[model samples]
Target: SMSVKKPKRDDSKDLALCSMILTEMETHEDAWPFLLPVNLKLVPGYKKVIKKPMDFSTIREKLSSGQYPNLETFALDVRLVFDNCETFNEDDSDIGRAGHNMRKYFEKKWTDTFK
Candidate 1:
């Protein structure tokens, strides 16, 4: 009888793809607001409202440190940055508009690269 065992999934390719996407995201014109964590001092009440703050710099560091176990986890953090922006800023505001644009760009790239 042959043994039935599932093969271990290799994530190197996915990791490399993620890195490429992140680099593009960081360089995006609308990426400024999301480049770093929101300064609590500069933006009062930011910490009180946003429970889980995320940013591009943090995501890049996480990627380099191997903190993300899979692409989904990495994507989650990327989305969180935009979600937080929507939560904190109005749609008409500059930051909010940028967040919307960045999200659209990311989703398209994600589909183009992964799907």
Candidate 2:
């Protein structure tokens, strides 16, 4: 729903989720995931690229193969944003390990299904 709206010309005070991520990084400050951003505008296209989206297979793949930190890190980052909204440190080690755990889970799932 929020992803459909285009970003505005004056984005000084407004902050979409992506902008919030950029702003905090730009200032060398970590965004407090738990805290609600005030005055910042929630620009659409800031969430899902398509908007009104789910079952995100393709996007998930793209995220999993990102350039900056790689795709697994990207997915973990997204998971943290949703699951641990109180804090997002972008810890690479922890997130990377967790992604493997997901793979392990699926491995067991498939193994049992064939058994």
Candidate 3:
């Protein structure tokens, strides 16, 4: 006989973050257009990746609430927004290194998760 077990892949946190991001962006309508790929001319992919503001409110909440175990999705959502951008770069000082720093922070979370 053969048996199978389910893998541990859950996206509840990602969906929650996505919802929070959209909800937060509702209050920062003016900041969305200039926040990412649009400002960096990577709109094509960036537009498809994230279409709203995702500042630190939810992030702060998660950290404060000690939602530490489910870290990958939390970090990936934000980073994926930029990583998927057509022109996102982790070393471009011209755009305040937004992509650079974003990549660094998210990847750091990934690395830390492994450790």
Candidate 4:
């Protein structure tokens, strides 16, 4: 990761950050069951494991192509999905606090994390 600056006129970096997080989740969960967003019901199959024919690159390209919904709302959508996961029990639990940590990290100077 590099210190790429985001100009005042655009929030692409913020959106990119969200995109990256979601991408990581999806990628990692490919090897196991994941608590995915219910909103992704239209993504071919819902509540099913991603199979061999999964179009992974297309999804990533869509995420970083500079066209998406509002950042805050999108982030909230992801947060909700993670919060709904069963492993996310107590806030102090390893997996449990992930949702909170995700929000805390992004809500601050997010660029720092990349650096």
Candidate 5:
């Protein structure tokens, strides 16, 4: 029922183009399932999604009201937590020590780094 004139091309070529378009649509068609009542595409590495939970006003308030925290250390600590959070064992003393060291290192970086 599409009234658009088809480009005059070989059948195979047309099929290939159609397949490519279909593949793209399929990749994203069911990408969002059971999403909250919002028309939003929360794709990874998408700046909007990445920054959705962030508020600059809150960040400024927290930093300005108190002494500014070192950003480098914060990044370091976050990295440590992220790396170990996936592998924590409450009963393993060795792992616990290593986790403690990582946390300490992260804190050190946070207090000393500029910007």
Candidate 6:
């Protein structure tokens, strides 16, 4: 008799890697600005400028819920946070600088893990 095999892509390793990277990002010193959603009330034009705003908290929720199928998709959302920051803030500004630092950290982590 032949046995049936489960049909599923085993992404547990990818999920673990994403989770680890996210955890480190959340604890980084420059992570404060990207921790939560931007205050749209304070920055009234934010919504108009940044169509899609991503943050650490939101990413964490997505990761917990298994919304990300693979590491590439997860990486895109992570990069979105910094990309939005760069578009909305001046490079010399505190938040902008933080975004730059965070991106550097993330890229290094990504390379170390996969490259």
Whole-model lDDT values for every prediction: 0.94, 0.35, 0.47, 0.47, 0.36, 0.93
Ranking by lDDT: 1, 6, 4, 3, 5, 2
Q: List the residue pairs that clash in candidate 4.
A: none
Cα shift from native, residue 28, model 3 (Å): 23
Report the poorest 10 consecutive residues by lDDT, candidate 5: 29-38
Clashing pairs in 6: none
* Rank ordering of all candidates by TM-score, starting from the highest: 1, 6, 4, 3, 5, 2
Using lDDT as the measure, which candidate wins? 1
- Provide the lDDT at 99 for model 2: 37
lDDT of 5 at 37: 19
Per-residue lDDT tens digits for candidate 3, residues 1-115, read: 2587778676556545544543443344332322432432634454454555344454455445666456555655555455443244334354445445444554554564344
RMSD of each: 2.7, 19.2, 9.1, 10.3, 22.3, 4.6
Model 5 TM: 0.27
lDDT of 3: 0.47
| Model 2 segments more than 4 A misplaced | 1-56, 59-92
Q: What digit string (tens of lDDT, one per residue) describes model 1 on residues 1-115?
A: 2797689677669989999999999999999999998898898999899999999999999999989989999999999999999999999999889999999999999999888
Question: CA lDDT of 55 in candidate 1?
Answer: 97
Cα distance off (Å), candidate 5, residue 99: 0.6
Candidate with better TM-score, 4 vs 6: 6
Candidate 5 vs. truth: CA RMSD? 22.3
Which has the higher lDDT value, candidate number 2 or candidate number 4? Answer: 4
Deviation in angstroms for 67 in model 4?
Answer: 8.7
lDDT of 4 by residue, 80-107 (tens): 4444443324666655565555545444
Estimate, for each residue in 34-64, the C-alpha lDDT of model 5 and write its tens digit.
1121233544333443323322233333334
Q: Report clash pairs, candidate 1.
A: none
Cα misplacement distance, residue 63 of candidate 4 (Å): 5.2
- Model 2 Cα shift for residue 24 (angstroms): 33
Q: Per-prediction TM-score, please?
A: 0.91, 0.23, 0.36, 0.37, 0.27, 0.88
Q: Give the per-residue lDDT digits (tens) of candidate 6, residues 10-108.
A: 666888888999999999999999999998889889989999999999999999997987788899999999999999999999998999999999999
